[PDB]
């Protein structure tokens, strides 16, 4: 229902990034532009190693 913040890190990029949990659009690494998370068929899934929650609220 309510969206939350989640901190993730690119496995290939190895860089840390913050994306939304279960987004709508494809998440491209702000670094190079590699897929870090895919919305797939309903319910977005993070295709990266999740670290924890971020303090960066909405």
Instruction: Show binding-site residues for Zn(2+).
Output: 10, 13, 29, 32
Instruction: Show binding-site residues.
Output: 10, 13, 29, 32
* CA angle in degrees (0–180, nearest 5) for 58-50-33: 80
Contacts of 6 (CB under 8 A, 6+ apart): 18, 19, 20, 21, 46, 50, 52, 53, 54
């Amino acid at each position: 229902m309510h969206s939350r913040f989640v901190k993730v890190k690119c496995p290939d990029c190895e860089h840390e990034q913050v994306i939304f949990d279960h987004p709508s659009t494809i998440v491209k690494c702000i670094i190079c532009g590699r897929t870090v998370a895919e919305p797939t068929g309903g319910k977005g899934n993070i295709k990266a190693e999740i670290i924890e929650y971020v303090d960066q609220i909405e």
